[PDB]
Structure 1
C-alpha cells in the first residue's frame, strides 16, 4: 500500500493506522482532518499512517473503479457483508501492522480506526485478527447484520480492545440506527465502548469529534 505518514514530533513509541472512507486516499483524509482542525492532527510520540486502499471494482458504483477497502452489495446494514473482499484486505492490512511491529512497535502500542468504510475495516481487523491492539475507533461506521465480527466475539474469551465510536445523528448515508445497533451488539458481546452522538452532524468529520477522538487516543497510547 501507498500511504501518507504524519511523524511524531519526537521519538516514535506508538502508531495510529487511520483508514479513509470510500473513494478517498490517505493524503485525502490527512488534508481533510487538517481542514476540519485548521492545523494538522499530530502527536508527540505517535506516528500516524494513513494508507491508501488500492483501486478496485465497487458494486455500489456499478463496478466502476474506486479506492475502497472492500466491496458492498448495497449501502445498508440489512444485507450480508462481502466477506471475501474484507478478508483479502484483512491480510493486506495485517502486513502493514506487521511492518510496524517489525520496527519495534509492540501490538499493544498500535491503535487502528477509520472513517465510514475505514472504521468498518478497522473493526474487522481488530476484533477478528488482532485482538491485542491498544483500541479501535470508528467514525460514522457500522457493521452489517450477522457480521463475522459478531461471530468471532461470540467465540472469544479474552480481553478485547475498547471501541470509540462517534456518529452524526443527522447522517442520511449511514443511518445513526445502524451505528447504534453495531455499538449495542458489541457491548452485548463484551466490548467496552464509548459511543458519542453529535446532533446536527451529517456524514462528515467535525472539530469537536476529532478533539474528543484525540483525547481518547492519548488515554490509550500514553
Structure 2
C-alpha cells in the first residue's frame, strides 16, 4: 500500500540537500513510497555561539557525550512540527503503520523524540547517529501505542561528533521506556552516512512492511 517516509536532516543542512538519499533506496518494494524532506527553521544554535542556521532544536554542547546538556523544551517544539506532518498524512488516508521516520544526527534525535511521543503506532523510526534529546522525566508521557513502534538505531563506532557511547546510552533509556530497539553498530564509521548503512535501513523497512 501507500508508504510514507519522512527524512529529517542534520544540523545546518536542508531538506532538498538530502532528497538524493532516496536514490540509494533502489528496491522495487520501496519504489512507490512517498518521501518528504522538510527543512528546519533558521534558529540560533548555542554550541555555535548563537549563530543562526537550519536547526530542528537548540544544541547546547557538541561533541555530544553521555551527560552532555540538552534543551528539552526546544525539542518538544520541533516534535510538534513533525507531528503536524504525520497528522496531515494520516488525515489523508495513510495507515500509520505505513509511516516511517528517519533522521541523521540532529534529525535522528528528532526522529526518536517524534516517534516516542506520537499517539499512534507508526511503521518505524530509523535513527542515524542520533542521541537521546531529553531526560527520563519525559518517559511517563510516551503514549501507549508509541511504545510499539520499532526503532532501528545505526551508529558509527568511530563517531567523535556524537559519541558512540551516547548512542549506546539510548538502549537502557529505551528499555526503561518499554521500547523495542535494534542497535546496529558500524565499525570505523564516523559522523556520516555509509551506503551499507542505508541498505540495511531499506532492508529493515521492507521487513517491517512484511
5 Å matches for 1:206-217?
206-217=194-205
CA drift at 1:152: 3.2
Matched residue of 1:129: which SS?
coil
In structure 2, distance between residues paired with 1:177 and 1:96: 31
**Which 4+ residue blocks in structure 1 deviate beyond 6 angstroms?**
none
Q: 1:203 is matched with which residue?
A: 191
Q: Residues 36-75 of structure 1: CA distance to partner in whole angstroms, max 9, x if unpaired?
A: xxx4435223111111111111111111111111002112
Q: 2:107 is matched with which residue?
A: 118
Q: 2:35 is matched with which residue?
A: 48
In structure 1, distance between residues paired with 2:145 and 2:101: 21
In structure 2, distance between residues paired with 1:100 and 1:131: 13
Structure 1 unaligned spans of 5+: 1-11
CA gap 1:200/1:159 in 2 versus in 1, 3 angstroms: closer
In structure 1, distance between residues paired with 2:177 and 2:8: 24
- Per the normalisation by structure 1, the TM-score is 0.84
CA drift at 1:78: 1.3
In structure 1, distance between residues paired with 2:54 and 2:137: 23
- Per the normalisation by structure 2, the TM-score is 0.88
| Count of matched residue pairs | 205
**Among candidates 144, 148, 158, match of residue 170 of structure 1:** 158
Structure 2 unaligned spans of 5+: none
CA gap 1:149/1:212 in 2 versus in 1, 3 angstroms: farther
CA gap 1:157/1:125 in 2 versus in 1, 3 angstroms: closer
CA RMSD of aligned residues (A): 2.1
**Among candidates 76, 93, 98, match of residue 87 of structure 1:** 76
